Design a protein around this ligand. Sequence first.
Ligand code: ZN
Length: 224
Amino acid sequence: KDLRKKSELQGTALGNLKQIYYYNEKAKTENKESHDQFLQHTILFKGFFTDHSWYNDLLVDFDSKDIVDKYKGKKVDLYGAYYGYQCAGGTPNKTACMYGGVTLHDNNRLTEEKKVPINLWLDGKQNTVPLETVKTNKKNVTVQELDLQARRYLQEKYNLYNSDVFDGKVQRGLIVFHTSTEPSVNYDLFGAQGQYSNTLLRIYRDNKTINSENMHIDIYLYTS
Ligand SMILES: [Zn+2]
């Protein structure tokens, strides 16, 4: 297809993708509230981390002040991948970074959690994915929240982000967040830019959320 290939992805790019989607901790937290803005289109959550870990503040970046004004001062829920490297922001080695992942709290919580159906095809051979693979308690959920889970599995079941010598067989792939309404969102499993989280995680900057009810995912893998 018109998919980018593993070959082109630097050894650190492929490594960081693997840390992001497999090795790293996601930032999940409910009923959070922030008034703090930081330079035109980012919200700053003072003391996002309540444990005793490296990072204290979190800096959520978005495409525009439109999205920022949609959440600033509102009770939001977070779910995403955060990074410390090149986290261009305020408090020194204390501010971590995330792109979007912000959701509106109220009325979003579902009665019973939704298991999002993934259809998989490795070289046409439709392989089946477990039903608990990707799940969310949100009526309206970020593509990032679904993505982080969807890709975790492809890392596990398929070593997607492995060097060709350690079974990184698939060399091209596409993930599709097919929704029951608007045009499905599609990602190229290898089309990220850069080799570090600062640019790789930028794809989610649009804070694109979708309807979880009556929706699923399509994953196409090609080992050629
Ligand atoms: Zn579909």
